[PDB]
């Protein structure tokens, strides 16, 4: 029925809905406001603007240690639930004992464990290699350590040799780097990156060595800093980006993800894939190192043994030669020697700096110095040199330990896939001891609550009396005792009560103090004591744990307390009984407990039902690599997608197309390229290098590339546009038809020109790829083109597609296969850009915010059309598993496509490099399915119509900040606005009336920042603060004026009057809503001042004029010589009688509150 299109950005989210013929649906929507407007017609197209500020959503989008903690805790809980039954057979208190602290209940097993397994890696490797059966607790320890620290998931596939190949990942880094800097690419050529990066040398040495292979590159340069990031160093990127503040990065550092996110928040998100590439390179180095069973655990054990023999050798040497320094080196934590390195606060750099002179003066052994220079002397267990480990390694050890032990333990074999899934997949607390006093109290009370005793149902005072007079006095209470106690016909009980306060009496006989037990304040202590008695079967451990309470009790009482031990575990958590409140469950018992849980009137049911689930989307987004703004944008795209789903009657869209790309320095890059290219072999300043013909002029040294004739200062694709769209300078060349000849790359007769191309090649004036293209079209090259135009390299967009895919596809079929109702397409920006260019759908950012919505619409159009035309290519640009079709087969001989440009089907006729024209059918359609995909006479008209329509839903998102006001509540003696600071807001929420009375009732209206209000002739205003207003209006322009402005600014002279018409429209708009006449007079006057100026500059300054009409906060803007100062709306009084418009995130659902 329909599909959604989206433009995703750091401060906006364009969205559009589209039918099979690319129409945008119109739909009525209810208006909930008191105003007499009961419905509204709206197009399903629009945009959501939003601030990057301090909101609850913002903090929800940040990483926190607590969330990671609860995450790992949940995974371990899932692990323990599988192990719990057999673990009860082995060690009932084992899982409770876990967080030096004792893993085991007795000293013997504990010391034996620590002696046999000094590090967890010893246990891991032993469990991987040994064929012998092992204790279930040990296997749990290894699996738990692996699941707890699973590592990253950057490599989607099963681990393969290309993943550990340092050379290929180096080429990847150079490639993603080159994409960001087309002007000065780094040439990997034949550089032996593997031998250099994996060499047994200091990281700084490997850096200098690798950079030595790359001419024109300094160590401080961005690529060199990335290589230093890969090697394990700590580069500072502030110099590379001219940052105001330090931007050091170290992959090994725990904060590196957040730090990288800060750097992205400064330099922009385009660089994120580059850093991800550097991290992948570091992973290749470490992986190749551990690869050359359980290689990771084996490498860790190797580091351990090496550390220890190096340590004993160094000790023997220091004993033999420098005895005076021995205590200082091995025992002084304050000093930078080994003691300060292991247990003091000394960095490996400080430590090596300390021992370097000492090892040299020693002359006892130089090999330790060799290990030191290579930084392998005394490595700690708690480090990995710049990197988090890929999960596949831990997974391999997981399969190894499970497969090895599954025979002895059948449940491991049965739950194997589940255990792996716990590591791979992307109430809260443990039960009381069975003999805890709180538990015994809960049992006796829960049984006691239901006792009939009807005479010619038990009172709570009667319950407390029965417990105090019977359950406390007697170790067990027979029913005849209950009857005789009633004396001093019953029902709900048998011959004797089965529940009893046995722990109360056991402790009573030992403590010999009833009041200490009866007192409620001491209960946490007694709980900890009984928990200690259950936790350990060993007296020394019980004594050690009980020592904390030793002041409270007699020595003899402690010695007696050590003997008692309990062996059971209860079925309920302590806080289910006494933590949750209404009034705790135990308070209610003192109605059945089960009935108590199931009463809707009481809060326990809601609190538990929430507790089972007790955010995951904000958390998943938080861990992505990006700026806070782009993440907030992802959140907004998700919410917008959900609302668009609701608007369409809960029917899922057939498709969702998504686009995420960024929307002076380059002139400096080009300047460097021209300067170097000229120095290797009519001066003009850099700002005009932006011009393509001029920059191509200087790149070619004032010479034609095809004809060998110098060109006077006062353009052709090397590989023709029909084969692929590459407007980049790499494919462009300035020329006099002369050299191009036919459709094939520039003619072999013109390839005799190639020596000049070679002189341009060694000058860096042209890239090697451009040389290879000039010197040439193979069918494989066509396959490369078709593969290139479709695939989207950006990683964050892949994560967005994955998120949207998970949100859109939940149902599974009987075969347990996923039911994919929805495709999530990911377009390259270039396709939509060139689509705007070839078919004259011009964009101008400054006229309005409409361009976001228009972009989303074009995204859905080009995307859905691209799927409909080439279903076989679905794997390349749709999320999910799909067959990767043999690309050569769809490529054809001259009789899918012979010309490799995938966008070609939109065109009615294609112009070849020779000028010959290939006509195409008016209606494009898929041959395999027979489905129509495009109608050139109708669909283009529908596109122009969609762009042309004035009504578009622009929504500036309202927000509540978290001397700063969160929101401004309207107050009614008289109407007025009042700010509410975050400090005030809590007490405000608690007792608002007394607060308002403190300041000096039926209507509570909190107004979030950017709240919308309407008044008079279509005018709108936003509440930036109680003291100021922003412009709420979006000036729409007819498409003729827009295309005219684009064409004039990018310089039909006959259409000169359109300047005056546009200025008339801006003035009518400014008078209708902007209300800044004093500035408008200056603007019109200045427009009269420079009518003499050429139409290009006139149109550019008219383009500057639009900031006056722009939605949002007013800003100063220069029009020719004149500058126009911003006009603030500092009076918010007019808003008080204005009609408030509460907007839906799409803006389709309005509620209009008018009070006046
Ligand atoms: Mn975009
Ligand atoms: Mn008991
Ligand atoms: Mn000249
Ligand atoms: Mn946009
Ligand atoms: Mn432009
Ligand atoms: Mn300008
Ligand atoms: Mn002037």
Three-class secondary structure assignment of 27-83: EEEEECCCCCCCEEEEECEEEEECCCCCEHHHHHCCCCHHHHHHHHHHHHHHHHHHH
Query: Which ligand has an atom closest to residue 692 CA?
Result: 5
CA atoms within a 13 Å half-sphere pointing along the CA-CB vector of 546: 28
Length in residues, the chain:
1156
Rounded distance from Cα 857 to ligand 1 centre (Å): 11
216: left (phi over 0), alpha (psi -120 to 50) or beta: left
**Helix H or strand E segment including 1098:** helix 1095-1109
Q: Say if residues 146 and 124 touch (Cβ distance below 8 Å).
A: yes
Query: Which ligand has an atom closest to residue 703 CA?
Result: 3
Rounded distance from Cα 1050 to ligand 5 centre (Å): 6
Report whether 852 belongs to an annotated binding site. Answer: yes
Q: What DSSP letter does each residue of 489-548 carry, written as one string? A: ---S--SB-S---HHHHHHHHHH--HHHHH-STTHHHHHHHHHHHHH-S-HHHHHHHHGG
Q: Say if residues 187 and 766 touch (Cβ distance below 8 Å).
A: no
| Separation between Cα atoms, residue 702 and residue 708, nearest integer Å | 11
**Helix H or strand E segment including 825:** strand 823-826
Query: Which ligand has an atom closest to residue 1088 CA?
Result: 7
Rounded distance from Cα 1122 to ligand 6 centre (Å): 13
Q: Which residue has the tokens 């803006």?
A: 1147
Phi, psi of 849 (to 5 degrees): -90, 0
| Separation between Cα atoms, residue 422 and residue 406, nearest integer Å | 17
| Catalytic hit among 7, 269, 310, 716 | 7
Paired tokens of 810: 């939940």
Report whether 959 belongs to an annotated binding site. Answer: no
| Separation between Cα atoms, residue 1012 and residue 1020, nearest integer Å | 7
What are the residues whose beta carbon lies below 5 Å from ligand 7 (ion)?
A: 1120-1121
Report whether 101 belongs to an annotated binding site. Answer: no
CA atoms within a 13 Å half-sphere pointing along the CA-CB vector of 305: 9
Alpha helices in 184-330 (DSSP H): 193-197, 203-212, 222-231, 238-241, 256-267, 272-291, 295-321, 326-330
- Listed in sequence order, the residues at least 6 apart from 800 whose beta carbon sits closer than 8 Å to its beta carbon are 8, 634, 637, 658, 660
Rounded distance from Cα 1089 to ligand 7 centre (Å): 7
Query: Which ligand has an atom closest to residue 1118 CA?
Result: 6
Q: Which residue has the tokens 């080159």?
A: 178
Rounded distance from Cα 1047 to ligand 6 centre (Å): 15
Rounded distance from Cα 833 to ligand 1 centre (Å): 10
Rounded distance from Cα 508 to ligand 2 centre (Å): 13
Q: Which residue has the tokens 């955010």?
A: 615
Rounded distance from Cα 962 to ligand 1 centre (Å): 29
Q: Which residue has the tokens 């710049």?
A: 386
- Chain-centre distance of CA 993, in angstroms? 42
Phi, psi of 12 (to 5 degrees): -155, 160
Paired tokens of 526: 């007694």
**Helix H or strand E segment including 560:** helix 555-563
Report whether 659 belongs to an annotated binding site. Answer: yes
Selection from 22, 143, 131 nearest residue 82 by Cα: 143
| Catalytic hit among 394, 717, 851, 854 | 717
DSSP designation for 346: -
Q: Is residue 980 helix, strand or coil?
A: strand
Paired tokens of 454: 């009807």
Selection from 332, 589, 278 nearest residue 443 by Cα: 589
Paired tokens of 777: 């079209």
| Separation between Cα atoms, residue 998 and residue 679, nearest integer Å | 76
Selection from 733, 762, 738, 767 nearest residue 750 by Cα: 738
| Separation between Cα atoms, residue 297 and residue 290, nearest integer Å | 9
DSSP designation for 936: T
Report whether 375 belongs to an annotated binding site. Answer: no
| Separation between Cα atoms, residue 510 and residue 956, nearest integer Å | 71
**Which method, experimentally, gave rise to this model?**
X-ray
Report whether 747 belongs to an annotated binding site. Answer: no
Q: Say if residues 921 and 730 touch (Cβ distance below 8 Å).
A: no
Query: Which ligand has an atom closest to residue 845 CA?
Result: 4
| Separation between Cα atoms, residue 234 and residue 629, nearest integer Å | 26
Selection from 221, 229, 237, 330 nearest residue 280 by Cα: 229
Selection from 716, 661, 947, 641 nearest residue 831 by Cα: 661
**Helix H or strand E segment including 837:** helix 829-838
Query: Which ligand has an atom closest to residue 727 CA?
Result: 5
Sign of torsion over alpha carbons 220, 226, 228, 232: positive
| Separation between Cα atoms, residue 764 and residue 186, nearest integer Å | 11
Q: How far is CA 591 from CA 209, 442, 1003, 1110, in A?
A: 79, 13, 41, 65
Torsion of CA 414, 417, 418, 419, to 10 degrees: 100
Rounded distance from Cα 885 to ligand 1 centre (Å): 29
Q: Which residue has the tokens 């200690």?
A: 532
Rounded distance from Cα 436 to ligand 3 centre (Å): 98
Instruction: Determine whether 717 is an active site residue.
Output: yes
What are the residues whose beta carbon lies below 5 Å from ligand 4 (ion)?
A: 7, 9, 663, 852
Paired tokens of 110: 């504990």
Rounded distance from Cα 703 to ligand 3 centre (Å): 10
Q: What is the CA radius of gyration of the chain?
A: 37
Q: Say if residues 346 and 336 touch (Cβ distance below 8 Å).
A: yes
* Three-state DSSP string of 1040-1071: HHHHHHHHHHCCCHHHCCHHHHHHHHHHHHHH
- Listed in sequence order, the residues at least 6 apart from 677 whose beta carbon sits closer than 8 Å to its beta carbon are 699, 701, 760, 763, 764, 765
Q: Say if residues 1012 and 1150 touch (Cβ distance below 8 Å).
A: no
| Separation between Cα atoms, residue 921 and residue 885, nearest integer Å | 26
Rounded distance from Cα 1009 to ligand 4 centre (Å): 23
Query: Which ligand has an atom closest to residue 854 CA?
Result: 4
| Separation between Cα atoms, residue 366 and residue 348, nearest integer Å | 19
**Helix H or strand E segment including 941:** helix 939-948
Order of all β-strands in the sheet with 965-971? 976-981, 965-971, 1005-1007
* Three-state DSSP string of 790-824: HCCCCHHHHHHHHHHHHHHCCCECCCCCECCCCEE
Q: Which residue has the tokens 């008018």?
A: 1154
Rounded distance from Cα 862 to ligand 1 centre (Å): 14
What are the residues whose beta carbon lies below 5 Å from ligand 2 (ion)?
A: 435, 502-503
Q: How far is CA 722 from CA 196, 719, 783, in A?
A: 42, 8, 14
Selection from 1105, 1129, 1100 nearest residue 1117 by Cα: 1105
Q: Say if residues 388 and 250 touch (Cβ distance below 8 Å).
A: no
Paired tokens of 1074: 């902007």
């Amino acid at each position: 029925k329909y599909s959604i299109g989206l433009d995703i950005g750091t401060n906006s989210v364009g969205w559009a809905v589209i039918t099979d013929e690319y129409k945008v649906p119109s739909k009525k929507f209810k208006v909930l406001g008191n105003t007499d407007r009961h419905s509204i017609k709206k197009n399903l197209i629009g945009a959501l603007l939003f601030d990057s500020g301090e909101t609850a959503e913002a903090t929800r989008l940040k990483r926190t240690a607590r969330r990671r903690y609860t995450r790992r805790k949940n995974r371990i809980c899932y692990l323990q639930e599988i192990f719990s039954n057999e673990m009860a057979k082995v060690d009932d208190s084992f899982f409770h004992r876990l967080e030096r602290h004792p893993i085991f209940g007795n000293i013997v097993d504990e010391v034996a464990y620590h002696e046999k397994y000094p590090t967890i890696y010893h246990l891991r490797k032993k469990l991987v290699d040994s064929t012998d059966k092992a204790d279930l607790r040990l296997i749990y320890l290894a699996l738990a350590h692996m699941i707890k620290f699973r590592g990253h998931f950057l490599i989607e596939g099963d681990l393969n040799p290309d993943n550990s190949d340092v050379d290929k990942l180096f080429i990847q880094l150079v490639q993603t780097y080159n994409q960001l800097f087309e002007e000065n690419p780094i040439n990997a050529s034949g550089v032996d990156a593997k031998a250099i990066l994996s060499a047994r040398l200091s990281k700084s040495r490997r850096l200098e060595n690798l950079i030595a292979q790359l001419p024109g590159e300094k160590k401080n340069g961005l690529f060199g800093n990335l290589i230093a990031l890969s090697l394990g160093l700590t580069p500072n990127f502030k110099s590379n980006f001219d940052l105001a503040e330090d931007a050091k990065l170290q992959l090994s550092k725990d904060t590196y993800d957040d730090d990288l996110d800060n750097l992205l928040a400064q330099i922009g998100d385009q660089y994120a894939d580059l850093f991800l590439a550097a991290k992948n390179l570091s992973d290749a180095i470490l992986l190749s190192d551990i690869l050359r069973k359980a290689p990771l655990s084996a490498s860790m054990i190797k580091r351990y043994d090496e550390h220890h023999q190096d340590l004993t050798l160094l000790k023997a040497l220091v004993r033999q030669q420098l005895p005076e320094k021995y205590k200082e080196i091995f025992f002084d934590q304050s000093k930078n020697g080994y003691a300060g390195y292991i247990d003091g606060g000394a960095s490996q750099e400080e430590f090596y700096k300390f021992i370097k002179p000492i090892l040299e003066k020693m002359d006892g052994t130089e090999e330790l110095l060799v290990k030191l220079n290579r930084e392998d002397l005394l490595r700690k267990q708690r480090t990995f040199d710049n990197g988090s480990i890929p999960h596949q390694i831990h997974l391999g050890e997981l399969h190894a330990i499970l497969r090895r032990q599954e025979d002895f333990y059948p449940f491991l074999k049965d739950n194997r896939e589940k255990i792996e899934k716990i590591l791979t997949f992307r109430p809260n607390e443990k039960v009381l001891p069975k003999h805890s006093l709180l538990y015994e109290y809960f049992t006796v009370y829960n049984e006691l609550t239901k006792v009939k005793y009807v005479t010619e149902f038990l009172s709570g005072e009667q319950k407390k009396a029965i417990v105090d007079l019977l359950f406390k006095t007697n170790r067990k209470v027979t029913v005849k005792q209950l009857k005789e106690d009633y004396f001093k016909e019953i029902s709900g009980v048998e011959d004797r009560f089965n529940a009893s306060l046995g722990t109360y009496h056991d402790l009573l006989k030992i403590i010999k103090d009833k009041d200490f037990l009866d007192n409620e304040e001491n209960e946490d202590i007694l709980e900890d004591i009984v928990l200690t008695l259950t936790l350990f079967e060993d007296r020394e451990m019980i004594e050690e744990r009980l020592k904390t309470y030793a002041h409270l009790f007699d020595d003899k009482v402690m010695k007696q307390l050590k003997r008692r031990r309990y062996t059971g575990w209860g079925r309920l958590s302590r806080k289910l009984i006494n933590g949750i409140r209404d009034k705790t469950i135990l308070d209610f018992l003192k109605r059945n407990f089960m009935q108590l849980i199931h009463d809707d009137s009481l809060t326990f049911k809601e609190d538990i039902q929430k507790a089972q689930v007790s955010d995951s989307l904000h958390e998943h987004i938080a861990n992505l690599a990006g700026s806070p703004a782009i993440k907030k944008g992802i959140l907004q795209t998700v919410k917008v997608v959900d609302e668009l789903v609701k608007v369409m009657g809960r029917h899922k869209p057939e498709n969702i197309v998504i686009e995420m790309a960024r929307e002076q320095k380059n002139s400096r890059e080009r300047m460097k390229r021209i300067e170097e290219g000229i120095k290797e072999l009519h001066p003009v300043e850099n700002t005009q290098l932006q011009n393509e013909k001029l920059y191509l002029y200087y790149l070619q040294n004032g010479r034609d590339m095809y004809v060998d004739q110098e060109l006077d200062i006062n353009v052709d694709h090397i590989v023709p546009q029909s084969f692929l769209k590459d407007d980049s300078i790499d494919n462009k060349v300035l020329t006099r038809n002369r050299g191009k000849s036919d459709n094939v790359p520039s003619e072999e007769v013109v390839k005799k020109m190639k020596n000049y191309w070679r002189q341009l090649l060694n000058a860096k004036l042209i890239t090697q790829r451009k040389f290879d293209n000039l010197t040439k079209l193979s069918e494989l090259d066509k396959a490369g083109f078709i593969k290139r135009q479709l695939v989207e390299t950006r990683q964050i967009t892949k994560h967005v597609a994955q998120i949207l895919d998970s949100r859109m596809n939940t149902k599974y079929d009987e075969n347990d296969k996923l039911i994919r109702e929805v495709k999530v397409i990911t377009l390259k920006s270039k396709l939509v850009s060139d689509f705007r260019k070839d078919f004259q759908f011009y964009k101008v950012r400054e006229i309005n915010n409409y361009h976001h919505a228009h972009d989303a619409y074009l995204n859905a159009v080009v995307g859905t059309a691209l799927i409909k035309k080439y279903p076989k290519l679905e794997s390349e640009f749709v999320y999910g598993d799909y067959k990767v079709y043999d690309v050569r087969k769809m490529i054809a001989k001259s009789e899918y496509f012979f010309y490799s440009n995938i966008m070609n089907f939109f065109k009615t006729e294609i112009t070849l490099a020779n000028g010959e024209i290939r006509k195409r059918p008016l209606i494009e359609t898929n041959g395999e399915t027979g489905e129509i995909v495009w109608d050139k006479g109708r669909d283009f008209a529908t596109v122009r119509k969609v762009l042309s329509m004035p009504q578009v839903n622009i929504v500036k998102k309202t927000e509540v900040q978290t001397p700063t006001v969160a929101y401004s509540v309207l107050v009614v003696s008289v109407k007025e606005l009042l700010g509410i600071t975050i400090m005030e807001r809590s007490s405000f929420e608690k007792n608002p009336i007394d607060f308002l009375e403190a300041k000096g009732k039926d209507l509570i209206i909190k107004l979030p920042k950017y709240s919308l209000f309407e008044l008079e002739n279509g005018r709108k205003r936003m509440l930036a603060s109680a003291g100021e207003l922003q412009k709420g209006n979006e000036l729409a322009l007819p498409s003729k004026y827009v295309n005219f402005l684009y064409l004039a600014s990018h310089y039909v002279e006959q259409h000169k009057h359109y300047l005056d018409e546009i200025i008339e429209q801006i003035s009518e708009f400014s008078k209708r809503v902007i209300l800044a006449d004093a500035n408008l007079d200056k603007v019109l006057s200045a427009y009269n001042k420079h009518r003499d100026k050429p139409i290009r500059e006139q149109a550019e300054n008219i383009i500057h004029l639009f900031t006056l009409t722009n939605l949002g906060a007013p800003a100063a803007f220069k029009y020719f010589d004149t500058t126009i100062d911003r006009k603030r709306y500092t009076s918010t009084k007019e808003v008080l009688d204005a009609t408030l418009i509460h907007q839906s995130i799409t803006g389709l659902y309005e509620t209009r509150i008018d009070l006046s």
